[model samples]
Target: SHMQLKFAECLEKKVDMSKVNLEVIKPWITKRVTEILGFEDDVVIEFIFNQLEVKNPDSKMMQINLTGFLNGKNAREFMGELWPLLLSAQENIAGIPSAFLELKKEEIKQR
Candidate 1:
């Protein structure tokens, strides 16, 4: 088997929703996040939530709230490029019942 990472629902931090299919999004996103960003499978992503922050994520754009280790140089780098990639996901994956995505940057930690 190949090297695998982990995803955290953040325990009670997770809320139940029927909007997005995180099952599909997780693997697809993890691939792009690390591969394009140039990281190994040591990434840990936390799926925060998929609440409707906006009535129409289409009128404006889908929002992806990121946290965790996003302050670091390596993890911070993902933010700058994440928007464009997610915009594509709007069409590629939006086949989402909601208007946004929830994610964090625990993937770059091993210290």
Candidate 2:
């Protein structure tokens, strides 16, 4: 087991998504994904927008889904391993508040 740090749900204020530039964030996602998965060569990562479940359209929180392949051997274990490292690295990620980020699994039955 490892020790984890905690923080607030949003910021001292709320996240001003208007001020966030998705374009700038995309590159960081790619870079971090590479480092986390030890990815190289034909590995591909995709960022898919799941939904914005709005409590109030005026105050909406954003959510997204990350689906990708690390390629080659150890791919399964690598996928799981990448997350904890990413979680730990979240605070250091692009100066964003750790509180604003979360990781979880959703149960889905698929064919």
Candidate 2 local lDDT, 45-96, one digit each (tens): 3321111111111111111122223322233333233332333334354533
Candidate 2's C-alpha runs over 4 A off are 1-14, 40-45, 48-111
Candidate 1 residue-wise lDDT at 70: 31
Q: Give lDDT per model, in order.
A: 0.33, 0.30
Please give the range of 10 consecutive residues that has the lowest summed lDDT in model 2: 55-64
For residues 1-63, could you state the per-residue lDDT of candidate 1 as single tens digits? 122222222221222223334444444445544554455343234321132232222211111
Best by TM-score: 1
lDDT of 1: 0.33
Clashing pairs in 1: 43-107, 44-107
Q: Count the backbone clashes (under 3 Å) in each candidate.
A: 2, 0
